[PDB]
C-alpha cells in the first residue's frame, strides 16, 4: 500500500 504515490498525470 502506497500512501505516497506518484500523483502527477
Amino acid at each position, epitope marked *: 500500500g502506497n*500512501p505516497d504515490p506518484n*500523483a502527477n498525470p
Partner: antibody
Amino acid sequence: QVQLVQSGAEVKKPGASVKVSCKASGFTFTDYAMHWVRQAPGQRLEWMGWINAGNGYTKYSQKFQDRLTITRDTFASTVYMELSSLRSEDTTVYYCARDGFCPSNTCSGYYGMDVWGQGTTVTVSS
Amino acid sequence: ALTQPASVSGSPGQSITISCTGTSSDVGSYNYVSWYQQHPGKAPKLMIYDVNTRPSGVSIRFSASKSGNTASLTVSGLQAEDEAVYYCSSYAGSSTWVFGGGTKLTVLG
C-alpha cells in the same frame, strides 16, 4: 524572485471562452506542475486541473473535462487555462499555483501548492 | 468537498483546532494533506503539506495531523493576524485534488 504573474481581468458573455495566462519566473519551469484553482466571491477554493510543465500531461476535474484545457509553453515559461462555454457560475477569481513534479514511485515531499499567482477576475454576464 | 466547520473562534493566546473530514478515498488513503491560509483579497498561502510538515518560514504555532479520515490543523498562541479563512486539501487519486469548504477563524477581542 520566484513568482507567477497572471494576465488581467476579463468580462465575458455566456457561451464565450476565456484564456488566462500565468507567467513563471525565478525557478526552473519544467521541474514543476501548475494547477488552476478558482474561487467565487465569498466561497471556497475549487480545484480545476493541472499540467506538468515539462511533459505537458494534464488532468482535469471531471466537472471541467468537457470545457477546460490547460496548456504550457516551455520557452515562454507560461501556462494557460482556457475555459469554454462560459456561464454565470464561472464568475470567480482564477489562480495558477505551482506544485511538484515527481519522477519516482514514492513522492513524499513533492506536493503542496507553494507559489500562487495573483489571481485573475473573470465576470460572466449577459 | 472535504468537510470543515464554517467557523472557529478563540481569544488571543489560546489554541484552536480546525477539522477537515474526507473519505477513505482521500484523507484516509494518502499523506498528501495540505492546509492553506487565505487573507481577504489575497491568494492562499501554504501552511502545512504532507499532513504535518511546515513549509520554510511558517510559524511553529501552526501544526497539523490526521487520524483516520479527519485531518486537524491546530493554531496555538492565537494572534490577531491569524484571522483568515483556512482550507484543507487532499489528494483524491487519479491525479486529482480536492479542497475543503474553508473555515473562518475569528480571534475574539
